[PDB]
Amino acid sequence: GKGKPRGLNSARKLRVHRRNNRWAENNYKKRLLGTAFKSSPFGGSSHAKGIVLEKLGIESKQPNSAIRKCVRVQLIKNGKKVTAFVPNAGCLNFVDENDEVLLAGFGRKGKAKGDIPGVRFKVVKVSGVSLLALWKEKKEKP
Amino acid sequence: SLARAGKVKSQTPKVEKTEKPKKPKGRAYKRLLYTRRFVNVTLVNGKRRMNPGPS
Amino acid sequence: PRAPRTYSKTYSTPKRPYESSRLDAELKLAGEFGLKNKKEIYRISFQLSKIRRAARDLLTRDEKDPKRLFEGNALIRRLVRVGVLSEDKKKLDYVLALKVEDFLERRLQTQVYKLGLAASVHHARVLITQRHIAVGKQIVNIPSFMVRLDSEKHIDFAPTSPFGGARPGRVARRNAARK
RNA sequence: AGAAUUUGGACAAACUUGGUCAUUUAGAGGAACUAAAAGUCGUAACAAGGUUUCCGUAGGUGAACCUGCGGAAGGAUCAU
RNA sequence: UGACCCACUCGGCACCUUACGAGAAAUCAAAGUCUUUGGGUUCUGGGGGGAGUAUGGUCGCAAGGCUGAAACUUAAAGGA
RNA sequence: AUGGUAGGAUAGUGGCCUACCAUGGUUUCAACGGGUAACGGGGAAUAAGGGUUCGAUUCCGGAGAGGGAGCCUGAGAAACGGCUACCACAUCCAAGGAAGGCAGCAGGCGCGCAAAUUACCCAAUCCUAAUUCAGGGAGGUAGUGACAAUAAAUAACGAUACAGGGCCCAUUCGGGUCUUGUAAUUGGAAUGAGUACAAUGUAAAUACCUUAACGAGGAACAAUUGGAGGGCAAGUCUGGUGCCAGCAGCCGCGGUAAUUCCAGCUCCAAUAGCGUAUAUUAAAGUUGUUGCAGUUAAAAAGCUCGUAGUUGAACUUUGGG
Of the candidates C57, C59, C55, C43, the one whose C-alpha atom is nearest the C-alpha of residue C100 is C43
End-to-end CA distance of chain B: 43
Question: Residue C59: which residues within 8 A CB-CB, separation 6 or more?
Answer: C92, C93
Interface contact flag, A89 B9, Cβ < 8 Å: yes
Per DSSP, what are the bridge partners of residue B45? B47
Nucleotide D31 C1' to residue A28 CA (A): 36
| Nearest nucleotide to A117, CA against C1' atoms | E74
What is the C-alpha separation between C160 and C137, in angstroms, rounded?
10
What is the C-alpha separation between A133 and A136, in angstroms, rounded?
5
Phi, psi of A70 (to 5 degrees): -130, 155
| Technique used to solve these coordinates | cryo-EM
What is the C-alpha separation between B50 and C31, in angstroms, rounded?
18
Of the candidates C144, C167, C140, the one whose C-alpha atom is nearest the C-alpha of residue C155 is C140
What is the C-alpha separation between C133 and C86, in angstroms, rounded?
26
Residue A126's SS3 state is strand
Chains C and B touch (3+ CB pairs under 8 A): yes
Among C18, C27, C123, which would you mutate to test the B interface (most chain B Cβ atoms within 10 Å of its Cβ)? C27
What is the C-alpha separation between A34 and A30, in angstroms, rounded?
5
Continuous H helices in C58-99 = 66-69
Burial class (CB in 10 A: 0-12, 13-18, 19+), B29: middle
How far from A119 is each of A71, A72, A86, A97, C94, CA to CA, in Å? 11, 11, 12, 20, 60
Nucleotide F318 C1' to residue C60 CA (A): 22
Give B7's contacts in chain A (Cβ within 8 Å).
90
The distance from CA A71 to its chain's CA centroid, rounded to whole angstroms, is: 14
Residue B32's SS3 state is helix
Tell me if C85 sits within 8 A of C94, measured CB to CB: yes
Question: Residue C92: which residues within 8 A CB-CB, separation 6 or more?
Answer: C55, C58, C59, C72, C75, C76
Amino acid at C10: T
Name the minimum distance, in Å, from the CA of A2 to any CA of chain B: 55
Of the candidates A129, A48, A116, the one whose C-alpha atom is nearest the C-alpha of residue A85 is A116
Tell me if A94 sits within 8 A of A131, measured CB to CB: yes
Of the candidates C128, C129, C112, C130, the one whose C-alpha atom is nearest the C-alpha of residue C120 is C112
What is the C-alpha separation between C81 and C76, in angstroms, rounded?
9
What is the C-alpha separation between A56 and A47, in angstroms, rounded?
22
What is the C-alpha separation between C34 and B30, in angstroms, rounded?
8
Chains in touch with A (3+ beta-carbon pairs under 8 Å) read B
How far from A123 is each of A50, A101, A131, A138, CA to CA, in Å? 10, 7, 8, 18
| Nearest nucleotide to A33, CA against C1' atoms | F35
Amino acid at C124: A
Of the candidates C11, C33, C29, the one whose C-alpha atom is nearest the C-alpha of residue C109 is C33
What is the C-alpha separation between A94 and A126, in angstroms, rounded?
8
DSSP state of A141: -
How does strand A70-71 pair with strand A50-51? unpaired
Contacts for C98-104 with beta carbons within 8 Å, 24 or more apart?
C98/C48, C98/C51, C99/C48, C100/C29, C100/C41, C100/C44, C100/C45, C100/C48, C101/C29, C103/C44, C103/C47, C103/C48, C104/C29, C104/C33, C104/C44
Asked whether the bond before A121 is cis by omega within 30 degrees of 0, the reply is: no
Tell me if B15 sits within 8 A of B21, measured CB to CB: no
Of the candidates A114, A110, A119, A101, the one whose C-alpha atom is nearest the C-alpha of residue A47 is A101
Phi, psi of C68 (to 5 degrees): -55, -45
What is the C-alpha separation between C146 and C148, in angstroms, rounded?
6
DSSP code string of C91-149:
---------HHHHHHTSTT--------SS---TTTHHHHTS---SS------S-----T
Amino acid at C84: V
How far from C71 is each of B47, C93, C94, CA to CA, in Å? 49, 13, 15
What is the C-alpha separation between A134 and A92, in angstroms, rounded?
11
The distance from CA B6 to its chain's CA centroid, rounded to whole angstroms, is: 27
Of the candidates C3, C85, C1, C2, the one whose C-alpha atom is nearest the C-alpha of residue C51 is C85
Tell me if C84 sits within 8 A of C98, measured CB to CB: yes
Nucleotide E64 C1' to residue A33 CA (A): 29
